[PDB]
Design an enzyme around this catalytic site. Structure first.
Site, PDB file in Angstrom:
ATOM      1  N   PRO A   1       5.847 146.344  27.490  1.00  0.00           N
ATOM      2  CA  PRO A   1       4.593 146.155  27.254  1.00  0.00           C
ATOM      3  C   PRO A   1       3.714 145.402  28.249  1.00  0.00           C
ATOM      4  O   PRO A   1       4.164 144.198  28.374  1.00  0.00           O
ATOM      5  CB  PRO A   1       4.407 145.922  25.758  1.00  0.00           C
ATOM      6  CG  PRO A   1       5.646 145.989  25.213  1.00  0.00           C
ATOM      7  CD  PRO A   1       6.653 145.887  26.247  1.00  0.00           C
TER       8      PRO A   1
ATOM      9  N   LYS B   1      15.566 153.822  27.440  1.00  0.00           N
ATOM     10  CA  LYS B   1      14.366 153.576  28.386  1.00  0.00           C
ATOM     11  C   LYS B   1      13.746 152.154  28.044  1.00  0.00           C
ATOM     12  O   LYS B   1      13.666 151.850  26.952  1.00  0.00           O
ATOM     13  CB  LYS B   1      13.376 154.678  27.660  1.00  0.00           C
ATOM     14  CG  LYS B   1      12.003 155.015  28.409  1.00  0.00           C
ATOM     15  CD  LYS B   1      11.227 156.026  27.657  1.00  0.00           C
ATOM     16  CE  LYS B   1      10.002 156.662  28.571  1.00  0.00           C
ATOM     17  NZ  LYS B   1      10.586 157.347  29.641  1.00  0.00           N
TER      18      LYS B   1
ATOM     19  N   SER C   1       5.371 152.827  38.539  1.00  0.00           N
ATOM     20  CA  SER C   1       5.998 152.684  37.214  1.00  0.00           C
ATOM     21  C   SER C   1       6.828 151.424  37.223  1.00  0.00           C
ATOM     22  O   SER C   1       7.419 150.909  38.191  1.00  0.00           O
ATOM     23  CB  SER C   1       6.732 153.664  36.936  1.00  0.00           C
ATOM     24  OG  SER C   1       7.618 153.688  35.930  1.00  0.00           O
TER      25      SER C   1
ATOM     26  N   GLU D   1       9.234 150.955  34.711  1.00  0.00           N
ATOM     27  CA  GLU D   1      10.100 151.625  33.686  1.00  0.00           C
ATOM     28  C   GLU D   1      11.531 151.352  34.406  1.00  0.00           C
ATOM     29  O   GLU D   1      11.554 151.586  35.746  1.00  0.00           O
ATOM     30  CB  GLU D   1       9.803 152.951  33.266  1.00  0.00           C
ATOM     31  CG  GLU D   1      11.033 153.653  32.498  1.00  0.00           C
ATOM     32  CD  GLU D   1      10.893 154.932  32.295  1.00  0.00           C
ATOM     33  OE1 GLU D   1      11.550 155.624  33.367  1.00  0.00           O
ATOM     34  OE2 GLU D   1      10.366 155.491  31.383  1.00  0.00           O
TER      35      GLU D   1
END
Ligand SMILES: Nc1ncnc2c1c(I)cn2[C@@H]1O[C@H](CSCC[C@H](N)C(=O)O)[C@@H](O)[C@H]1O
Length: 279
Positions: free
Chosen positions: A165, A161, A191, A193
């Site tokens: 930041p 994952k 997102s 991610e």
């Protein structure tokens, strides 16, 4: 949506070729994880390192989609052991599987050494989805733990994952492994991610300017790219996320033979959607 003509989608973060100033499906989270992990493990299958491995999935609960992953490779004849480790309880659909070991525990350095000892010398493939909105200190603690997983478990490959930041919440530069940053279709609308995919470990420094670059590149992806209809795409759904999923699913192996590549992907998507109960 706006129309566009594309030969291929963006598969990894490095391929995003523009930036933009950031501004404020049923069970779509399981679909996101299932696709990325099918993509990762199918790449390992193509490299011939998946057979005979033990998959250590840390942060796996509830992990409903993991049942489809295990069934997929079990029906392909690939010999895989699964070790699912999480402090929370797993989905009951993962019960009664002899090749799947369910562990109810939060991992630390001491426990990582013990499982390495018991699995040694078998090949280890690491999948991590551990988390805690999280603070930057939480992410730094999470990413430190993922580094500890790699240095102790010493996996042959890993999927981690990875969300950088936010620049306006920076604390300190930190280090992550080298690897390819796989992009995720059907992620939340905005997102940032991704999944860090590595085949083995040299560490790499992440700075506040990297955080700015991530924020702007991923916003352009979410605001512009993913809101396009790929008009040349030969598929019942031409939205970019389906175009993206299509290119991930074509790397997947199947026991059944199909007259065309499109027929294979269509079968796979139907199979995935039905198991996850998506219309
Ligand atoms: N040290 C650790 N050892 C073990 N598990 C740890 C930690 C830490 I720090 C966090 N987690 C777990 O990561 C999950 C995040 S969402 C998973 C979603 C899951 N992949 C799914 O398929 O639904 C939570 O279930 C949490 O319990």
């Amino acid at each position: 949506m706006d129309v566009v003509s594309l030969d291929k989608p963006f598969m990894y973060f490095e391929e995003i070729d523009n930036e933009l100033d950031y501004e404020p499906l049923p069970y779509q989270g399981q679909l996101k994880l299932l696709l990325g992990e099918l993509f990762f493990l199918s790449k390992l299958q193509r490299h011939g390192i998946l057979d005979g491995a033990t998959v250590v999935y840390i942060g796996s609960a509830p992990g409903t989609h993991i049942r489809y992953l295990r069934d997929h490779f079990y029906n392909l004849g690939v010999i895989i052991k699964w070790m699912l480790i999480d402090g929370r309880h797993h989905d009951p659909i993962l019960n009664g599987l002899r090749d799947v070991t369910l562990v109810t525990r939060f991992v630390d350095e001491e426990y990582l050494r013990s499982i390495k000892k018991q699995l040694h010398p078998s090949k280890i493939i690491l999948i991590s989805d551990v988390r805690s909105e999280p603070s930057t200190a939480d992410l730094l603690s999470n990413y430190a733990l993922q580094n500890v997983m790699i240095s102790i478990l010493n996996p042959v490959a890993s999927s981690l994952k990875w969300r950088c930041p936010f620049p306006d919440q920076w604390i300190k530069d930190f280090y992550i492994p080298h690897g390819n940053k796989m992009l995720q279709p059907f992620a939340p609308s905005y997102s940032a991610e991704m999944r860090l995919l590595s085949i083995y470990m040299r560490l790499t420094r992440v700075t506040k300017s990297d955080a700015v670059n991530y924020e702007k590149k991923m916003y352009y992806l979410n605001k512009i790219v993913r809101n396009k209809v790929v008009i040349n795409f030969d598929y019942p759904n031409q939205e970019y996320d389906y175009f993206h999923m299509y290119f991930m699913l074509r790397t997947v192996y199947c026991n059944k033979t199909f007259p065309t590549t499109k027929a294979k992907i269509l079968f796979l998507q139907q199979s995935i959607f039905r198991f996850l109960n998506i219309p």
